[PDB]
Enzyme design. Structure first.
Site, PDB file in Angstrom:
ATOM      1  CD  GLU A  51      -1.220  -6.656   5.699  1.00  0.00           C
ATOM      2  OE1 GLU A  51      -0.461  -6.956   4.756  1.00  0.00           O
ATOM      3  OE2 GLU A  51      -1.601  -5.488   5.919  1.00  0.00           O
ATOM      4  CB  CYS A  85      -0.950  -0.008   1.200  1.00  0.00           C
ATOM      5  SG  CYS A  85      -2.536   0.792   0.899  1.00  0.00           S
ATOM      6  CG  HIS A 138      -3.590  -3.804   3.699  1.00  0.00           C
ATOM      7  ND1 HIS A 138      -2.715  -3.362   4.667  1.00  0.00           N
ATOM      8  CD2 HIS A 138      -4.178  -2.696   3.190  1.00  0.00           C
ATOM      9  CE1 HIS A 138      -2.768  -2.044   4.737  1.00  0.00           C
ATOM     10  NE2 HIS A 138      -3.648  -1.615   3.852  1.00  0.00           N
TER      11      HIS A 138
END
Ligand SMILES: O=P(O)(O)Oc1cc[n+]([C@@H]2O[C@H](COP(=O)(O)OP(=O)(O)OP(=O)(O)O)[C@@H](O)[C@H]2O)c(O)n1
Ligand SMILES: Nc1nc2c(ncn2[C@H]2C[C@H](O)[C@@H](COP(=O)(O)OP(=O)(O)OP(=O)(O)O)O2)c(=O)[nH]1
Ligand SMILES: Nc1ncnc2c1ncn2[C@H]1C[C@H](O)[C@@H](COP(=O)(O)OP(=O)(O)O)O1
Ligand SMILES: [Mg+2]
Ligand SMILES: [Mg+2]
Ligand SMILES: [Mg+2]
Ligand SMILES: [Mg+2]
Lengths: 60, 556, 41
Positions: B528, B399, B526
């Site tokens: 994760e 990001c 993202h």
């Protein structure tokens, strides 16, 4: 685990003391290691004392 | 429907989220369907307007809701897709009741807290308990976690609501596990039970009573302390569970199982769980814990982030890195690097810290530049990206890291020394990263590109495409407000860069990759948030493999 | 009560408390005191 000094128990103790009728004039914070400026600021803001009324004694 | 309420003791970082996730893991190992409702007594509608320092990293859901990291823990441990209704805040309840009162649902009587706010809370809990969350699964147990500690002003409505709720649904369907802290100061040298007694007294004054007492400490507490807790909390010796700081959170379900929590909950809530079949139920967690114990090979990743003063501000990123490290039989050495200390201004103020952080960065196998907000520490991220690209050091930017990589590439390779982001420099001659027009309506909170989207792989051989599994498109969660500018896009692509990730409209670029450099991958989403213990995120896995020089072998 | 909570929720949804947790004692009570100050004068 939490990785930060926690001010909640002191807030609860101050709330109990005030509900008992006593407002602290000084607050002695006992810690193993010195706490930062933000911890003292949070103590002053949530326990409703001045920044200079929060005394911080650590493990000498 | 059965309910387990997890309340807090003297602090809010005690571990209620891990205890609740372990309850869910134990119950779903038996064969039950478990729901999870996080209650946040704060008045914010969601967690999108939170600093990472307030409560930890902010988690993003599929539907776009920005929530607490507790929901991230729930999804990681239970492998379920939560919704916006699984988080209950004070603001949500009050907004609901105010809208209802304005419309005219409460005509005739004044709207109060006890008959109306608590009723709305109970209705919300009962309605969201039955909402399927893993598909067609109909839940059987709902694990409600009360954020904070007992005794807060914000939590009184919820405590009163649950005091009425236990009698509404009968006690057989309702249980309460109280998690408390037992401090062991160095000066005193003894575990102290007084805060737990105070917490239990407050919770009994509020009208409830803990079925379980979960005592949290750093080291195992002696039997004298446990018996003192059993004596001064009016709970039996076997109703006090001692959970100390473990090596990983995979040991927590195993410890609770060894403590007989499953049997007690089966008897207390009449779950009708059969013990004979439930053998080797937690084999996944035992295997994961054993692997975490017996990893010898070392992989070091430098996290060039701006929220490193608090280690839980990158909780999901650390978990994804751990998943990737375990998926290749490597022990993760994680070195957090404050990106501010990497800037030249730090050199003229703290030369020792400057050189210490730079030799931390130069001694790592790989670099990870995570997301973030604001302008503080951005120059450190750009300097880290420049060093990684110049020295062939693997880098994975997320990001805000993609924007830093694009800015560095434009400033160095293209010569545009004034390249910057409108987020930082609105008056930019060459605005390499610009704001998305429809996400700047002056209303912060639930107004970015949030949640699952569609990212299209460009026509061309890219190793990041191969990492994901050679697809045509992937769906990933976004939490950004700024985007890369098209013309600069074109120029850079020409030079040395390959924008290999776009959306269906082929205007918003999401993934970049560099010719030459072994691994220089930056994303707009993202990765994760979609990482699970047995499902490592492909970008993190590729970063780890490139760090340990095993990416080429994994390709073939 | 309804006015205070509606006001605080609308303020929070715009970004007046950007980055901090909105609570009762620091925020609801501050809104009540600011209301009293602006109305009394
Ligand atoms: O974390 P969970 O799972 O319980 O989820 C949590 C944790 C906390 N809260 C709320 O936040 C406010 C202060 O939080 P907080 O306990 O951190 O007090 P504080 O003033 O910061 O003192 P301290 O230094 O001890 O932290 C309180 O209104 C509460 C919520 O809604 N959910
Ligand atoms: N700065 C910023 N924060 C946003 C935005 N949208 C949602 N948020 C959230 C993330 C931030 O953690 C929080 C703002 O609180 P902070 O200013 O303390 O976080 P920030 O990352 O900006 O650190 P900093 O201000 O540089 O010390 O609001 C946005 O557009 N800009
Ligand atoms: N038994 C245990 N041993 C070691 N670490 C633990 C633990 N329980 C929790 N932790 C860690 C994980 C979390 O990031 C942090 C506490 O946060 P949490 O588990 O969400 O608690 P809470 O929900 O009270 O905030 O400490
Ligand atoms: Mg928490
Ligand atoms: Mg939690
Ligand atoms: Mg806090
Ligand atoms: Mg800011």
């Amino acid at each position: 685990a939490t990785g930060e000094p926690k001010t909640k128990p002191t807030q609860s103790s101050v709330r109990e003391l005030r509900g008992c009728g006593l407002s602290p004039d000084l607050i002695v914070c006992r810690s193993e290691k010195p706490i930062g400026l933000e911890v003292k600021e949070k103590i002053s803001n949530f326990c409703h004392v001045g920044p200079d009324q929060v005394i911080c004694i650590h493990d000498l």
